[PDB]
Design a protein around this nucleic acid. Structure first.
Ligand SMILES: Nc1ncnc2c1ncn2[C@@H]1O[C@H](COP(=O)(O)OP(=O)(O)OP(=O)(O)O)[C@@H](O)[C@H]1O
Ligand SMILES: [Mg+2]
Lengths: 463, 71, 71
DNA sequence: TTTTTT
């Protein structure tokens, strides 16, 4: 009977080392699952577990070479693989897992059954995870200053506290969020607060993932977001200036799918799991290459209307339309945030918000009204109705309005379309839209015959 | 051997190859195809598909099926 | 080999290839009209110890704009 | 072209 083989078998019987679908080895050390492709975590586990073995086995693990032998045996006995990260409503920490449904905190073997390969990076503390505390009273003041509790701002505030609470879930989100506002409105303060709240589950990337192709060669900017729960892109440029590239309309469609194709350097893995809420903070509204219905159901906007200014520049701020109120700036808040003063209170507030919106089911919805570029496409659907068979008997009235029958279909030639459409949209501001629209839906019956398959709703009602 | 029919329509055989007047191809294209929507296709076809035997005659080595019908 | 359509010219390709096997290789018109010393060329690596190479389906080079062969 | 990769 080989002694090291017996040690390897006893270690394997504790289910402390597992093999994943991606080829990685995950090790249960210090109430958390850890993995790394450059460090020997298995030897660390072997050294750590020696206290649970009987005394004639513990002394044999002090020699590194015997640890390598046991590692080789353990590698030889692992033949089947398992799935990881399947529970969306569990928040993993450095020393346990927090349940978001009831609020209980699990540690030890109770937390081992949830195979989580990510963590916040810091230890949970129930002492500071309370509602009655001076830091909570302080934090509520900043939160109310950024988002006032007024009737005009109610809907926007609810959307603001839904998007933030969406960052605690490990599922796929079907919308992207834009934080739009003028300078000095608190957009970055919430980013710092969320980073301090969630730790390692937060990530910030560049702007290439909205502009460049994601699948040409290595791209760490897209492969570093695997299994993350919050992604921030910051400060996209103004597109009015010449030379600025526009946002790929098809790129944001790939950022919604549960799987994203990307490759790190010196790697063959091309699949990344999408668990992240994507937030872009901006000073200018975005511009897209192409506008379509698939694009309009994936965009949301949150506004910021409070300005924090020094006393010298207060007088100008009150004369700006882009602000609704002006408040004195605090010069010591950034240092307090950097010191993780408001970490656990913001975590408690995020959990409280999570229980309000996402317990039945988690879903995000778009707000296409905020974007002014969409205003044309939204309006056309309310002014033009597609031709149908049921409209044939009514054409007796439509004859006086200039409609012509072609191929037994109600049609309206191009020449008479322009003055009809000019009664709603001005030529100067919407010239490119109606030009593109007419070229993309023009149909010709002959070399000199033109017709369109739409009728106005105002034309089916007798004047 | 079918030139006996083509000569009935005024078509010609030059440089030992059957050819038609150019104006005839554009009138047939206009009469069967819409110029506005397929002008680029017709222009590319003509430019990349033209053949010449000398510095004066340009020709295409193809015959319409409708030309085979008896006049 | 010069000939007209439906003239067993493609059949002899099969008779020869069945007779030779993997050594026989096909090629297109991409390489004969383009410079092989410029850019990557997998065919330049591929003909290594090939026994015979066959080129067919050549478009007519008499058309204007069609890039003739490079001698 | 060059990081890429070897
Ligand atoms: N509730 C508050 N009371 C007082 N000062 C505050 C409050 N919230 C934020 N501030 C201060 O406002 C200043 C400007 O805020 P911040 O930098 O977050 O604005 P912003 O709109 O995100 O700016 P930008 O996008 O230009 O970076 C910061 O120095 C911050 O300390
Ligand atoms: Mg900011």
């Amino acid at each position: 009977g080989n002694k090291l083989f017996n040690i390897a078998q006893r270690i394997l019987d504790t289910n402390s080392v597992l093999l994943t679908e991606r080829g990685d080895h995950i090790v249960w050390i210090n109430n958390s699952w850890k993995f790394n492709s450059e460090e020997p975590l298995i030897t660390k586990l072997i050294l750590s577990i020696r206290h649970q073995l009987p005394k004639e086995y513990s002394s044999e693990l002090l020699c590194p070479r015997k640890r390598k032998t046991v590692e080789a045996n353990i590698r030889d006995m692992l033949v089947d693989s398992v799935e990881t990260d399947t529970y969306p409503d569990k928040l993993p920490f450095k020393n346990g897992v927090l349940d978001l449904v009831d609020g209980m905190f699990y540690s030890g073997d109770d937390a081992k059954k949830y195979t989580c390969t990510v963590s916040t990076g810091f230890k949970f503390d129930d002492t500071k995870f309370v509602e009655d505390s001076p830091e909570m009273e302080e934090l509520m003041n900043i939160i109310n200053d950024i988002q006032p509790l007024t009737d005009e701002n109610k809907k926007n505030r609810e959307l603001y506290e839904k998007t933030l609470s969406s960052c605690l879930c490990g599922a796929t989100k079907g919308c992207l969020t834009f934080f739009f506002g003028e300078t000095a409105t608190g957009k970055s303060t919430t980013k710092r607060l969320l980073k301090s709240a969630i730790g390692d589950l937060f990530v910030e990337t560049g702007q290439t993932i909205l502009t460049d192709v994601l699948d040409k060669g290595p791209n760490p900017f897209i492969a570093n977001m695997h299994l993350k729960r919050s992604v921030f892109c910051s400060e996209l440029p103004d597109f009015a200036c010449s030379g600025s590239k526009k946002i790929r309309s098809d790129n944001i469609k790939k950022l919604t799918e549960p799987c994203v194709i990307g490759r790190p350097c010196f790697s063959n893995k091309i699949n990344n799991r999408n668990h992240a809420t994507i937030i872009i903070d901006t000073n200018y509204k975005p511009v897209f290459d192409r506008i379509d219905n698939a694009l309009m159901r994936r965009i949301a906007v949150v506004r910021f209307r409070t300005h924090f200014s020094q006393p010298s520049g207060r007088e100008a701020a009150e004369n700006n339309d882009a602000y609704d109120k002006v408040k004195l700036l605090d010069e010591g808040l950034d240092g307090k945030i950097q010191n993780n003063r408001y970490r656990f209170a913001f975590l408690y507030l995020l959990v409280k918000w999570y229980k309000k919106y996402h317990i039945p089911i988690m879903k995000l919805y778009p707000t296409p009204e905020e974007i002014p570029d969409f205003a044309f496409y939204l309006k056309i659907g309310t002014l033009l109705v597609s031709s149908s068979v049921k409209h044939i008997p009514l054409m007796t009235d439509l004859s006086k309005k200039g409609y012509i029958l072609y191929d037994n279909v109600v049609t309206l030639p191009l020449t008479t379309f322009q003055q009809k459409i000019s009664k709603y949209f001005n030529s100067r501001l919407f010239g490119h839209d109606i030009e593109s629209f007419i070229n993309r839906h023009k149909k010709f019956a002959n070399v000199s015959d033109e017709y369109l398959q739409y009728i106005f709703i105002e034309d089916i009602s007798s004047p």
